[PDB]
């Protein structure tokens, strides 16, 4: 088993993850030579006043 | 102090989330000698449309 | 680059937040040569729900 | 699946290990109605010179 | 910006590795229209004798 | 309880690690209202070849 953690702001489409989880999963099964079912996706999708850069929240920035 | 954290879909009930927390605390306290306030549990819930096995959403699940 | 994740109970002011992050990356920057621009601070914010000390998640307590 | 990630100064022996995950496991499974398979435990062993509390390195006594 | 973090069993040869870390670079950064340059990834690579499934540690499973 | 996790590539001394636990536990304590007992500070180092930005791990960008 592989786990892919993929941290971004919050905000993308349904349709824009799936392709994103579906991508992802194919090139490490293939890549790393895990069962197809056996690679996990996890997105931890962070708010706009969670997450700084340069000491400044992107809801300031914003 | 040690730290347990749980990843799991989210939508389980309160009782079974409680029950799970005071079962873990208990036996992390136990088997590795640490006072209860030392236990601390985090429930990283995962939304089913944050979460992919196969390659598929469960928000998605096909079924 | 250097990153910065800070686990917390969900609740804290907008303002406080919002400081913490501007010191936290100018301590982070000056102490280990790091440009402000590569430091990175994130929030991980929990509910009461998900957060338990001594077998107890902080949603059951009283008040 | 559930994955429960314990962190933890490293140091403990094998088999207080072992059986922390043993017992977590069967706990977690029976309780959440998840496959005895599909639980995972992943132990995060932090180096003394790691972890701090109250701004002092454990290493530092 | 975003960061991809792989929690995978320790042990992969370094080839394998950059290509993994060039694919997923570009797939993040071609999906999600984030600058290649600012896509980061981390490889958590876990000991076999701290990961486990089934009950199970993989450094017992396996020897 | 608070805690900090800082994820920065391993080899920093340990006089530094010492003054950046003590600098980062006394601004949390400070704006959060936390005990000091209350903060903790997880120092998460990875490898130069466990880390890329653009595609590039460390360890690769270093030579070989």
């Known amino acids: 088993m592989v786990v892919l953690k993929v ?3 919050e905000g993308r489409p349904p349709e824009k993850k799936r ?3 579906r991508r992802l999963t194919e ?3 293939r890549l ?3 069962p197809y079912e056996e690679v996990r996706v996890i997105l931890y999708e962070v708010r706009r006043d ?3 850069a340069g000491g400044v929240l992107f ?3 914003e």
């Open 27 to 29: 090139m490490a099964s």
């Open 50 to 52: 969670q997450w700084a």
């Open 19 to 21: 392709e994103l989880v």
């Open 32 to 34: 790393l030579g895990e």
């Open 59 to 61: 809801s300031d920035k």
């Open 7 to 9: 941290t971004l702001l």
